[PDB]
From Swiss-Prot, chain A:
Glycans are attached at T24, S26, N32, N44, N267, N280, N321, T340, N361, N369. Changing N141K: In strain: Omicron/BA.1, Omicron/BA.2, Omicron/BA.2.12.1, Omicron/BA.2.75, Omicron/BA.4, Omicron/BA.5, Omicron/BQ.1.1, Omicron/XBB.1.5, Omicron/EG.5.1. Changing L69I: In strain: Omicron/XBB.1.5, Omicron/EG.5.1. Residues 20-205 are annotated as: Receptor-binding domain (RBD). Residues 104-106 are annotated as: Integrin-binding motif. This is Spike protein S1. Disulfide bonds join C37-C62, C80-C133, C92-C189, C202-C254, C281-C313, C326-C335. Changing G40H: In strain: Omicron/BA.2.75, Omicron/XBB.1.5, Omicron/EG.5.1. The chain holds residues 300 to 744 of 1273 of the full protein. Residues 35-191 form the BetaCoV S1-CTD domain. It comes from Severe acute respiratory syndrome coronavirus 2 (2019-nCoV).
From Swiss-Prot, chain D:
Residues 54-56 are annotated as: Integrin-binding motif. This is Spike protein S1. Residues 94-102 are annotated as: Immunodominant HLA epitope recognized by the CD8+. The chain holds residues 350 to 547 of 1273 of the full protein. Changing S22L: In strain: Omicron/BA.1. Residues 1-172 form the BetaCoV S1-CTD domain. Residues 1-186 are annotated as: Receptor-binding domain (RBD). It comes from Severe acute respiratory syndrome coronavirus 2 (2019-nCoV). Changing E130K: In strain: Beta/B.1.351, Eta/B.1.525, Theta/P.3, Iota/B.1.526, B.1.1.318, Gamma/P.1, Zeta/P.2 and Mu/B.1.621; May enhance affinity to human ACE2 receptor. It comes from the Viruses. The gene is S. Binds to host ACE2. RBD also interacts with the N-linked glycan on 'Asn-90' of ACE2. Cleavage of S generates a polybasic C-terminal sequence on S1 that binds to host Neuropilin-1 (NRP1) and Neuropilin-2 (NRP2) receptors. Interacts with host integrin alpha-5/beta-1 (ITGA5:ITGB1) and with ACE2 in complex with integrin alpha-5/beta-1 (ITGA5:ITGB1). May interact via cytoplasmic c-terminus with M protein. May interact (via N-terminus) with host bilirubin and biliverdin, thereby preventing antibody binding to the SARS-CoV-2 spike NTD via an allosteric mechanism.
Length: 396, 204, 99, 192, 120, 99
């Protein structure tokens, strides 16, 4: 009724909606995690250089496990000037620069970004707006030897000021010098997530950044060793190599098709039957409102009567072994009609009565009478003549 | 001196399995039946990208140097096979032009009867190597036939290249932007190709 | 129910015009589908950006109708040529052309 | 910015030219309407939303913008019809001007939130007390004459309502006699 | 099935419906054409067991249970011819078309034109 | 080569559908032809400005296909009317119409 924008429906088959099998879960596959960032050695180290000359390093596209710095609460201090350590583990450093020594004096916290002081402007540099976070370990554990900052000069993070320093060797990372594993922004990027793998189920997927939805399946397709995925004649991706165990999957699009409502006229009955075009009935009881919602709609999904046909899964009509002239068409020789205590039947259409003409080499049949027959034929000859003022239609 | 390329120097344009299909693609390719320079080392322009080959079974040809200067100042590729491994570095030293016997490095990596063939190109900050090894009979010109080079290596190193030289029989030809039609067989290898610009029949 | 061919011709012309009218309600990505809203709310330079979306969508709506009317008119002409042929051969004569 | 104040405006004549012509305002950007046309229109309601922010944050006050103000304090709906107005207010400079630094998730269009819970960027379950990368969520601008993007700016956002509801706030235009049967140009409540 | 795109698509109104209405008119017409051409005959005539057609040999064009009902020549013809988008089946299957070509042919052989003008 | 007319019907249907699918990969002036790029790389207004090009291009591509199929269907109907006429006059009768 809504499809036709009317409260009356004449006898027919009407396409009303599209059926579409939904992705049941999301799957992710990426290569095994390796080549982790080395800078955790700087956090675990027992000593560092003073803020006048903090040692420095660079990342080399290595795996930045920055979420481990959120667990770095064993540090005597911490600082930030941008995104959280979880966000850093969900991202990558746009610049490689990394820590190797300590900040000291008034700039002592410059092992981490968001610091301030003379050394924090250069020789133990840690900007007031550097895009990240870090922990800092004090002179009592990692930032300095037993001379503290008082043995030297002070005021990316924890890397490269001229004043004589005075921060205490025994203190926490505010009053003492401070040093840690640190960096500030392809240079070093977060670890790749993954899940277990599912077959013969409609899923959402990611393989190596190839993303889509489909029924994943095992396959015999012979990819070359360097090849990672395969393509259709129309270039659509349709096979993939699993990066964690190098088997070849074949990707099937999750089932979809038109939904058509078979109805007699609304004068005769409010009863209907429903065809899922090209669907196989086992693949229904799935997806849209027609299975999900009410007895009255899921009567046309989950039971009542269900019948597979070459045209698709047909529901709510009764299969019959007789054959008749085609009332409402369906496809592939199938038709439906409302019959008598009453229901919609579905049947193979009949071409006509069978006959064998009584032919033989010496027999003829001659008519002994006739009927005059008057027959109607109808042809359209003309349309409604129209004119449209396009300036008045377009510009009003 | 010059020799013909015939139909050598095709390579797999992407890491993709296409099977039993003809695919048309535009890339830096060695043009069909173009000329190729021959050599028995000299320093050479890199142009848009290089096709390289040599008659080998001995490792006389230890590898290559690439860069803008290729010496004495700035980050420059050294690529070597030393029998212990294939070895790669991006250093800037004024190091020797022939450091082998009497026959900054911010990235580093490790892994006649015959011919070895290679393609070098440098796109979007990635330096890319494709290659093959094959038996031969003719040595003084490239052997007439077909063979698709496959990717070895694909490095994020971002260095500019305009010049290169061989580390001491060998051949150089240059890639150009062209459209090729590639015949992928049922097992996903390229087995024939058409250079679409070559002649009116190839264009057809 | 015998006159289904003729009543179909009337129905197609009605649905085509009613669809052509209903597309005047559509926004096509402008801030309103009613042209006097745009002209009252916005000053001259800002208004043209909205009006050209409606001009583009309404013009494509009308080109779609005229194209389907040209095709529909050719189908009716093929019927009118057949009806003119049936009148010459069946009415004005007697035809031996089977069925 | 977290206690941002909404005043309803109704049952009046208005004159937006007084606002638009005032030398006081450093921005006057309007959305879905042009500032010149406001004196011709009439609206079903008007609402004025107001607060103080640092001057650099003013650029976040738009539909489809992003940043801490939009995430955690005050955000416009994507089809917002109205005007955004702001000016420097250096005479106010002062540490009372709270904004929200972190939230469990971003707040909704025209939403407001008083919450003061300690959020955690470090791995510790800090459960209502500060510590290593866990913090109390309302903190304030240090407004001083020494601050330009850090200076105090006063803000007003005018939100306009264009419903099928009755006309309620109109520009300074005057009505005339209700002529009938002639072909007339007309304007009722801004419906031309 | 992107949501943000599917909202923007509403701004265009009835275009993604008069496309379906146009294609549905074409789809129904293909079933009409097939019926206009083959369904001339009101009864499914079939040939006798005997084949005494005066020396003419129709065995190449008549049905054959070793060949679906298709004739020998119909089997040559069927061998020599070789997303968001969906292809729909025809109303009549190839086995139904083959029964109409059989009925037309069996009428023609046994009864001349008379099976068109009345009873065979 | 005897059945060139029937083989051409098969080829034209396949060619049209294949082209309609290949047009999914075109930019139409947008930042990418893969819809998740535009949604994920850009702020909401920039994404909506870019997506409307893909909607326009794909919608124009689909109206192009349906118009081509409407014209192609009228050609096939004109042949089906000839085949229905041939069957009525030649099979069910004996036509005297030369050739
Ligand atoms: C009708 O003609 C067919 C051939 O058109 C005859 O059948 C063939 O007969 C020859 C010789 O006996 C065989 O080599 C073929 O293998 C036969 N073909 C088949 C399909 O059987 C058939 O015998 C003729 N019948 C009459 C009554 O004339
Ligand atoms: C329903 O019945 C009425 C007469 O009672 C008739 O005029 C009308 O056309 C019928 N409607 C349908 C859809 O058959
Ligand atoms: C990934 O790691 C697991 C062990 O952790 C191993 O079984 C698997 O073979 C590895 N796959 C690859 C491609 O390295
Ligand atoms: C799909 O339909 C075929 C018959 O057409 C049947 O053999 C098969 O089992 C069906 N698939 C499922 C999953 O039921
Ligand atoms: C219909 O025919 C099938 C075999 O095709 C048979 O199993 C079934 O019992 C029949 N049903 C009726 C109602 O005769
Ligand atoms: C011929 O048919 C008519 C009815 O059509 C009948 O009245 C008449 O008696 C018949 N004549 C013969 C000789 O059968
Ligand atoms: C190119 O090839 C032709 C033969 O095809 C040869 O005669 C000519 O010398 C070559 N020229 C160069 C510049 O290599
Ligand atoms: C050869 O390469 C190996 C690593 O593959 C390296 O250890 C060795 O020092 C190299 N030797 C020479 C002479 O290059
Ligand atoms: C590093 O750069 C200097 C010039 O700044 C150069 O002399 C030196 O050779 C380079 N070092 C390496 C390891 O290439
Ligand atoms: C690389 O070459 C380009 C021009 O081709 C130039 O703009 C760029 O500055 C060069 N970079 C280096 C590091 O030489
Ligand atoms: C293709 O692969 C199969 C095994 O999958 C092998 O038997 C066959 O020889 C291969 N053919 C070619 C031409 O590579």
């Amino acid at each position: 009724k809504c499809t036709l924008k009317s409260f009356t429906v004449e006898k027919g088959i009407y396409q009303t909606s599209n059926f579409r099998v939904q992705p049941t879960e999301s799957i992710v596959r990426f290569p095994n995690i390796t080549n982790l960032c080395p800078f955790g050695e700087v956090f675990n180290a027992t000593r560092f250089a003073s803020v006048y000359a903090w040692n420095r390093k660079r990342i080399s596209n290595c795996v930045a496990d920055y979420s481990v710095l959120y667990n770095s609460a064993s540090f005597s201090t911490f600082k930030c000037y941008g995104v959280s350590p979880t966000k850093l583990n969900d991202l990558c450093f746009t610049n490689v620069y990394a820590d190797s020594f300590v900040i000291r004096g008034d700039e002592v916290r410059q092992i981490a970004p968001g610091q301030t002081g003379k050394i924090a402007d250069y020789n133990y540099k840690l900007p007031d707006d550097f895009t990240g976070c870090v922990i800092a370990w004090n002179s009592n554990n990692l930032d300095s030897k037993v001379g503290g900052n008082y043995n030297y000069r002070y005021r990316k993070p924890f890397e490269r000021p001229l004043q004589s320093y005075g921060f205490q060797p025994t203190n926490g990372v505010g009053y003492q010098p401070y040093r840690v594993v640190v960096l500030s922004f392809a240079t070093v990027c977060g670890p790749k997530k993954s899940t277990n793998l599912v077959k013969n189920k409609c899923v959402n997927f990611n393989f190596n950044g190839l993303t889509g939805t489909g029924v994943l399946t095992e396959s015999n397709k012979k990819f070359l060793p360097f090849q990672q995925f395969g393509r259709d004649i129309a270039d659509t991706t349709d096979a993939v190599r699993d990066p964690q165990t190098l088997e070849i999957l074949d990707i099937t699009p999750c089932s979809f098709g038109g939904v058509s409502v078979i109805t007699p006229g609304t004068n005769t009955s409010n009863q209907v039957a429903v065809l899922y075009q090209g669907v196989n009935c086992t693949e229904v009881p799935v997806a849209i409102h027609a299975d999900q919602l009410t007895p009255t709609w899921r009567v046309y999904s989950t039971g009542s009567n269900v019948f597979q046909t070459r045209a698709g899964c047909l529901i709510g009509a009764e299969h019959v072994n007789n054959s008749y002239e085609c009332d409402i068409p369906i496809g592939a020789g199938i038709c439906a009609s409302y019959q008598t205590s009453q229901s919609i039947i579905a049947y193979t259409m009949s071409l006509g009565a069978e006959n064998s003409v009584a032919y033989s080499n010496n027999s003829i049949a001659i008519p002994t009478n006739f009927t005059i027959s008057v027959t109607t034929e109808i042809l359209p000859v003309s349309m409604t003549k129209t004119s449209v003022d396009c300036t008045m239609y377009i510009c009003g | 001196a010059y020799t013909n390329s015939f139909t050598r120097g095709v390579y797999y344009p992407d890491k993709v399995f296409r099977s039993s299909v003809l695919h048309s693609t535009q890339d830096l390719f060695l043009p069909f039946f173009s000329n190729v320079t021959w050599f028995h080392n000299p320093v050479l322009p890199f142009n848009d990208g290089v096709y390289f080959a040599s008659t080998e079974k001995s490792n006389i040809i230890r590898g290559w140097i690439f860069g803008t200067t290729l010496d004495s100042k700035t980050q420059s590729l050294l690529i070597v096979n030393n029998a212990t491994n294939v070895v790669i570095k991006v250093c800037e030293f004024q190091f020797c032009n022939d450091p082998f016997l009497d026959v900054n490095c911010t990235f580093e990596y490790v892994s006649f009867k015959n011919l070895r063939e290679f393609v070098f190109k440098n796109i979007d900050g990635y330096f890319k190597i494709y290659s093959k090894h094959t038996p031969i009979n003719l040595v003084r010109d490239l052997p007439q036939g077909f063979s698709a080079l496959e990717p070895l290596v694909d490095l994020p190193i971002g260095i500019n290249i305009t010049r290169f030289q061989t580390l001491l029989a060998y051949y150089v030809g240059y890639l150009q932007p062209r459209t090729f039609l590639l015949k992928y067989n049922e097992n996903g290898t390229i087995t024939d190709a058409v250079d679409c610009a070559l002649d009116p029949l190839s264009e057809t | 129910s015998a006159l289904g061919k003729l009543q179909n011709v009337v129905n197609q012309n009605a649905q085509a015009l009613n669809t052509l009218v209903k597309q005047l309600s559509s926004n096509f990505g402008a801030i309103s589908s009613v042209l006097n809203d745009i002209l009252s709310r916005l000053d001259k330079v800002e208004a043209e950006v909205q009006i050209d979306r409606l001009i583009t969508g309404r013009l494509q709506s009308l080109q779609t109708y005229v194209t389907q009317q040209l095709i529909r008119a050719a189908e009716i002409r093929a019927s009118a040529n057949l009806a003119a042929t049936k009148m010459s051969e069946c009415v004005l004569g007697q035809s031996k052309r089977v069925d | 910015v977290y206690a941002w104040n909404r005043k309803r405006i109704s049952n009046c004549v208005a004159d937006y030219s007084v606002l638009y012509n005032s030398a006081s305002f450093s921005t006057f950007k309007c959305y879905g309407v042009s500032p010149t046309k406001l004196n011709d229109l009439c609206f079903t309601n008007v609402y004025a939303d107001s607060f103080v922010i640092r001057g650099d944050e003013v650029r976040q006050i738009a539909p489809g913008q992003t940043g801490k103000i939009a995430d955690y304090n005050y955000k416009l709906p994507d089809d917002f019809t109205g005007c955004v107005i702001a000016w420097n207010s250096n005479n106010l400079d002062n540490y009372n001007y709270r904004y929200r630094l972190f939230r469990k998730s971003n707040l909704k269009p025209f939403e407001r939130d008083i919450s003061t819970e300690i959020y955690q960027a470090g791995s510790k379950p800090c459960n209502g007390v500060e510590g290593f990368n866990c913090y109390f969520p309302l903190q304030s601008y240090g407004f001083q004459p020494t601050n330009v993007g850090y200076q105090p700016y006063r803000v007003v956002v005018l939100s306009f309502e264009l419903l099928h509801a009755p006309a309620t706030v109109c520009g300074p235009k005057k009505s005339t006699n209700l002529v009938k049967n002639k072909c007339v140009n007309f304007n009722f409540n801004g419906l031309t | 099935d992107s949501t943000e795109c599917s909202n923007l698509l509403l701004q265009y109104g009835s275009f993604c419906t008069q496309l379906n209405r146009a294609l549905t008119g074409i789809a129904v017409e293909q079933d009409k054409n097939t019926q206009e051409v083959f369904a001339q005959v009101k009864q499914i005539y079939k040939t006798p067991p005997i084949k005494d057609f005066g020396g003419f040999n129709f065995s190449q064009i008549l049905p054959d249970p070793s060949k679906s009902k298709r004739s020998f020549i119909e089997d040559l013809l069927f061998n020599k011819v070789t997303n968001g988008l969906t292809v729909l089946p025809p109303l009549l299957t190839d086995e139904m078309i083959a029964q109409y070509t059989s009925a037309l042919l069996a009428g023609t052989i046994t009864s001349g034109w008379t099976f068109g003008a009345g009873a065979a």
